[PDB]
């Protein structure tokens, strides 16, 4: 048999991880956020 072997292969690329993000130039202190300890006040 001339075709002594016929090696099959499967190939799969990986996926790309993406996220949705907000931004806005005019606004509040927290510009954008992804779609109660309050220890933040204590230092002042």
């Amino acid at each position: 048999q001339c075709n002594e072997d016929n090696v099959e292969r499967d190939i799969q690329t990986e996926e790309i991880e993406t996220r949705e993000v907000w931004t806005q130039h005019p606004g509040e202190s927290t510009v954008v956020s992804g779609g109660t300890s309050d220890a933040v006040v204590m230092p002042k």
């Binding site: 109660t36 300890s37 309050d38 220890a39 006040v41 204590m42």
Partner: protein, 36 residues
């Protein structure tokens, strides 16, 4: 005897700040909601 009154003592800014600190720290420790 613990004398929490602290009567034979005086200060104006030290005691005012201490009162402020007491309240702010006590509330902060409650908010931590520790399960301990």
């Amino acid at each position: 005897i613990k004398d929490p009154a602290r009567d034979p003592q005086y200060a104006e800014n030290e005691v005012d700040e201490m009162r402020i600190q007491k309240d702010l720290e006590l509330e902060q420790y409650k908010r931590s909601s520790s399960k301990s």
